[PDB]
Each structure stands twice: as C-alpha cells, then as structure tokens.
Ligand binder design. Structure first.
Ligand SMILES: OC[C@H]1O[C@@H](O[C@H]2[C@H](O)[C@@H](O)[C@H](O)O[C@@H]2CO)[C@H](O)[C@@H](O)[C@H]1O
Ligand SMILES: OC[C@H]1O[C@@H](O[C@H]2[C@H](O)[C@@H](O)[C@H](O)O[C@@H]2CO)[C@H](O)[C@@H](O)[C@H]1O
Lengths: 134, 134
C-alpha cells in the first residue's frame, strides 16, 4: 500500500527524517502527518506535473469529514524525478518546521495546535527507503 | 492498533533500532519482522508471565496459512515491567542478529532466506517510542 509509520507517536520536540526516491515520470507524491488518511495536520505535496502545477510544493491540512483547508504554496523545489530526497520535520504547537534535501526550509502553521501525531505516510509517485523518528 | 512500520523495506545490511516501554502488569509483548500479520520471519516474544513461561524470550517464525514453526528460547531477559528497552536487529540471508538493551545478543536463523521485509510491528503489552531503520 503506501509507506506508513503508525502508532509510534510523533510528539513535540522529536524529529522525523524520511528519505526516499522519486519515481521516473512522477506526477506528484506527498508526505502526510496526522491521525488517519482522512485527518492530516500537515500535507506536503510535491508536484512535478499536476493540473496546472509544475515544480511546486503545496502544503495544506485535511479535516476529517470536512475536507482540505487553505493551501500554502512554495516555489522551493530541489527535487528531480528518478532521484533521492531527504526531509526533516519537527514542530511545536504553532509551527511545523520542514527542512528540504538542499537545506532550504519551509514553515507551515500547526492549525489545530496538536502535540502528537500517530500516523506518518507517503502516497503518490515515490517510495521511502529509510526513516528515523526520535 | 499496534505500532507498525509498513512498506519501508528492511533490507540486507540495514539496521532497525526500536525503543519503547513495557507496560506495568505486562503479560508479554513481541517485535515481529515479516510480510504481514500472518507471515512473520522473526517473531521475538518477551514473556513476563505467559502460561508456564516466566521471564523468557521465545523466538519463532509464522508461515502464512500454515502456523508457527520450531521455537527457540533464550534465558537472557534484561527487561523490567514499567521500564524502557531498546533493541537493534540486522540480518544477512542466514541469520537475524539481535542486540538487547544491555548489549547481550541473540541470533535466530533466517529460515526462508529472505532479503527484505515490508512489515515491522509490535503487539502485546508494550509501546514504541522511537524507531530508526536505515
Ligand atoms: O491542498 C492540497 C490538496 O490539493 C488538491 O488539489 C487542489 C489544487 O491544489 C487547487 O489548485 C485546485 O483549485 O483544487 C484542487 C482540488 O481541491 C488535491 O486534489 C489534494 O490531493 C491535495 O493535494
Ligand atoms: O512460538 C511462538 C508462539 O508461541 C505460542 O505459544 C506456544 C508456547 O510457546 C508453547 O510452549 C506451547 O506448547 O504452545 C503454545 C501455542 O503454540 C504463542 O501462542 C504464539 O503467540 C507465539 O508466541
């Protein structure tokens, strides 16, 4: 199915580093941190070609039985199809701090002010090769 | 549910370190490396009190739609209910190499000669607090 880390709580102060490989001919893939596949506090989508979006990062949250909220977009896109990537995420109750493969960072609001998350997963056209959550 | 790391391949040469806490009044808990909850190549059960077994490690494999194979048991048991533990696992095509919190080791045959595993999970009376698989 998708690559999942489930019920190993990602809590305030811990760091999550995932590494993987983008597929050749990838459309998009995302890293999702939340509660379930329908309850995502930080959705980070990497769009190689999706609709009108080409080489952009789109960040958003998904509320259970409600839907996607306000998107934030970033133009920082050090990603290449067929290549490796590595991303580190930490958060406090106000902000998710994300660091990309090249050291550039992107910040996204912790909109629900959650202190722990029990599901981390990747979906779309990429695969994970390692994870550290500590 | 249980603590799971799914579809992030654990391959020949990589190391898996999981850390957690044993519940107070724990009966037993296990760390399972395999393909599914019905297909486990290395089952490591930690028995505080289970039947006639008290403070013993039991290792075995579970074959899909067949069942448990020959058990191997170890008397090394540096575990205390309510306390933390940390375990490191690597394997080659013949052997799973397991290192316990106190540095003692236990070895178990890789009975199917598998080179990669797509499910790592914990079940029973413990919880995981961190994982590194790299
Ligand atoms: O916001 C994350 C969310 O985006 C959806 O796509 C949006 C698209 O970004 C937007 O430009 C357009 O107006 O509406 C689309 C549908 O809501 C994705 O479908 C979804 O998977 C998430 O990635
Ligand atoms: O071997 C792992 C497997 O053990 C089962 O328990 C065994 C028990 O170890 C043995 O002494 C007894 O004779 O038979 C029991 C049932 O097969 C557990 O039930 C199972 O969960 C695994 O842990």
């Amino acid at each position: 199915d998708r690559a999942e880390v489930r019920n190993i709580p990602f809590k305030l102060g811990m760091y999550l580093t995932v590494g993987g490989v983008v597929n050749s001919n990838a459309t998009r893939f995302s890293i999702n941190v939340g509660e379930s596949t329908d309850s995502i506090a930080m959705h980070m989508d990497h769009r190689f070609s999706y609709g009108a979006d080409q080489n952009v990062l789109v960040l958003n949250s998904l509320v259970h039985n409600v839907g996607w909220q306000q998107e934030e977009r970033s133009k920082k896109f050090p990603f290449t199809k067929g290549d490796h990537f590595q991303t580190t995420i930490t958060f406090d109750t106000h902000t998710f701090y994300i660091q990309l493969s090249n050291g550039e960072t992107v910040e996204f609001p912790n909109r629900n002010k959650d202190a722990a998350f029990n599901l981390i997963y990747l979906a779309g056209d990429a695969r994970l090769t390692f994870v550290r959550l500590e």
